Design a binder for this molecule. Sequence first.
Ligand code: LNK
Length: 12
Amino acid sequence: RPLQWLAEKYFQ
Ligand SMILES: *CCCCC*
């Protein structure tokens, strides 16, 4: 679950 980078772009 590589959501680390994903969160920076999508959520934040
Ligand atoms: C790892 C990212 C934490 C939320 C910004």
